[PDB]
């Protein structure tokens with residue numbers, strides 16, 4: 001009949017480094033029905049049992065898992081999780097797939113809402129990823145060895161054989177160029193424009209062992225373990241502090257870029273979108289997403305309406321802090 005969704009967890013009581021690849025959280029292979037998707041962080045958490053091993057979880061579980069497993073900062077966890085949930089989760093059962101569609105999220109929502117999981121392309125998941133191919137090429141969720149080979153190449157060329165912030169700057173730009181040249185449906189706007197810079201530093205801030213204090217750099221062995229195998233490095237210790245997108249500004253600065261996309265179903269035809277969110281116009285992202293939610297849920301009532309209102313408020317609490325203040329929207333009024 002429905003769940004009453006609780007407010008998000010706050011930061012963990014203990015925020016220092018610790019062993020996260022421990023005896024209680026062993027890597028285990030996929031079973032039938034287990035879901036994995038485009039996020040190596042969530043994938044690894046599920047394969048080590050920080051999340052349900054089937055890859056279906058509540059927002060609350062996802063937040064706590066990203067904190068426990070990686071020391072993902074609380075507000076960043078809230079912004080990412082409720083974004084994912086609002087667009088791609090089942091608001092009634094309070095369950096989100098970290099990958100594709102599954103009966104495990106429960107009775108489907110009214111169309112055009114889908115609860116189809118983080119795999120759904122075009123509003124959250126998008127193009128020019130590091131180890132995943134653009135949806136246009138037919139698979140936006142699987143690890144892609146050719147792309148990981150480029151990751152290794154760029155690490156060799158710019159990072160001494162390791163992934164560091166210099167490499168991030170170069171790889172991000174190059175991957176944008178690849179999509180311009182090869183993908184006629186390439187989009188790099190709104191949510192994707194913002195998340196694409198954060199994701200390039202997460203390997204440095206979160207996949208590098210927390211006992212490394214200076215010269216933070218990720219080995220290709222550790223990268224492959226997480227990105228491909230969904231496995232923590234042996235004896236992996238999380239970041240010694242809550243962290244998220246530190247250094248993403250410098251990635252952009254290395255190759256200034258403007259939100260937009262290839263126009264008119266043609267390659268090498270990138271047109272700027274002046275209405276898109278960008279890093280000095282973050283609240284546009286809030287407004288865009290609320291708009292998208294209204295398209296998914298044009299006239300909700302009952303538990304669905306209630307759970308939408310709550311989840312929108314939950315998300316806003318994170319957005320308000322992370323974006324430095326946005327006016328809360330109330331598309332369905334109040335409870």
Ligand SMILES: *[C@@H]1O[C@H](CO)[C@@H](O[C@@H]2O[C@H](CO)[C@@H](O[C@@H]3O[C@H](CO[C@H]4O[C@H](CO[C@H]5O[C@H](CO)[C@@H](O)[C@H](O)[C@@H]5O)[C@@H](O)[C@H](O[C@H]5O[C@H](CO)[C@@H](O)[C@H](O)[C@@H]5O)[C@@H]4O)[C@@H](O)[C@H](O[C@H]4O[C@H](CO)[C@@H](O)[C@H](O)[C@@H]4O)[C@@H]3O)[C@H](O)[C@H]2NC(C)=O)[C@H](O)[C@H]1NC(C)=O
Nearest residue numbers: 155156157158159160161162163164165166167215216217
């Ligand atoms: C990601 O990982 C990558 C890979 O590890 C990493 O890249 C390293 O980046 C650092 C910088 O961040 C590199 O170090 C810098 O190198 C600068 C350039 O070095 C060249 O030029 C030096 C200066 O040249 C002057 O003097 C010569 C005459 O000697 C003259 O011709 C020039 O015109 C100019 O006037 C030169 O000394 C240097 O040569 C020495 O070193 C090389 C080896 O690199 C050696 O072969 C030579 O025999 C000689 O010993 C070289 O040709 C350098 O300028 C810069 O120095 C700054 O810091 C010093 C203090 O240490 C200051 O005194 C100085 O004023 C500068 O401000 C610095 O050392 C490093 O070499 C990279 N490593 C690799 C593997 O490429 C990224 O940093 C990582 N990214 C992140 C964010 O972590």
Ligand SMILES: *[C@@H]1O[C@H](CO)[C@@H](O[C@@H]2O[C@H](CO)[C@@H](O[C@@H]3O[C@H](CO[C@H]4O[C@H](CO)[C@@H](O)[C@H](O)[C@@H]4O)[C@@H](O)[C@H](O[C@H]4O[C@H](CO)[C@@H](O)[C@H](O)[C@@H]4O)[C@@H]3O)[C@H](O)[C@H]2NC(C)=O)[C@H](O)[C@H]1NC(C)=O
Nearest residue numbers: 132133134137144145146147178181182183184265266267
């Ligand atoms: C893993 O990920 C990679 C990268 O996303 C995928 O490989 C790409 O596959 C696409 C589709 O097959 C390739 O697209 C085609 O590229 C041509 C240009 O290629 C050259 O130039 C690029 C850089 O500019 C190099 O990376 C590449 O090595 C080549 O030297 C274009 O000419 C093609 O355009 C035609 O098709 C499009 C789409 O219909 C039309 O819009 C055009 O008008 C035109 O008719 C085309 O876009 C792409 O080159 C591949 N890249 C690489 C690096 O291989 C893998 O498929 C993916 N999968 C796995 C499992 O590996």
Ligand code: HEM
Nearest residue numbers: 038039041066070072080084125126129130131132199206
């Ligand atoms: C907190 C909730 C999280 C959500 C909802 C989430 C969601 C996503 C999604 C949808 C993508 C694909 C983006 C795209 O294709 O445009 C992605 C990619 C990524 N996520 Fe997560 N993520 C979360 C937490 C984390 C954490 C904690 C980490 C690291 C510890 C992480 C690291 C990454 C990285 C590195 C990528 C990029 C993979 C690539 O480009 O190859 N995420 N995430």
Ligand SMILES: CCCCCCCCCCCC(=O)O
Nearest residue numbers: 079080083194195198199322
């Ligand atoms: C100052 C930058 C604020 C960053 C807002 C990012 C919005 C959602 C983040 C999702 C990150 C991820 O892919 O895990």
Ligand SMILES: [Mg+2]
Nearest residue numbers: 126127129132
């Ligand atoms: Mg993608």
